[PDB]
Amino acid sequence: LEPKNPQAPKNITVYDYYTRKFKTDELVDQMIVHFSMDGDYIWKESNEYKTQEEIRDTKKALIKERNKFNYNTRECQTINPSIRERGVSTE
């Protein structure tokens, strides 16, 4: 049958902020997915244990014999125009 996936869109678009055009896309991924859940458990992997056990090792040994002086609050906000509702006709 070469499946098509109902409850899928026909095309996808996104603004490109370097070349100012849009650019659409008509090949759409067609895998139903529901309840994707992300994990945080990590078993005798090479890459992770050294990076984590080593930072905590250095910290606890250092305190066994603070440096980063007190932080400074700040603020910034974007400019947010108002939303209005105007309706006109040509009839």
Partner 1 sequence: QYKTFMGARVLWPPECADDILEGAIRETQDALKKFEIAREGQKIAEHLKKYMDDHFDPYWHVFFGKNFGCQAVHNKNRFIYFYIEKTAFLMYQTQ
Partner 2 sequence: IDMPENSEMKSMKNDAFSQAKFAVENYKFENKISSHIKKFFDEKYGPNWHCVVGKHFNAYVSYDSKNFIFFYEGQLAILLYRKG
Partner 3 sequence: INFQDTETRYGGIQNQVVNINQYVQRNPNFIDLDNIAELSEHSVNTERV
Contact status: 78 vs partner 1 (CB under 8 A): no
Pick from 3, 6, 39, 81 the residue near partner 1 by CB under 8 A.
6
* C-alpha pair distances (Å), 56 with each of 42, 49, 52, 68: 17, 11, 6, 17
Contact status: 89 vs partner 1 (CB under 8 A): yes
Pick from 22, 35, 43, 69 the residue near partner 2 by CB under 8 A.
22
Contact status: 73 vs partner 2 (CB under 8 A): no
Find where tokens 């896309």 sit.
25
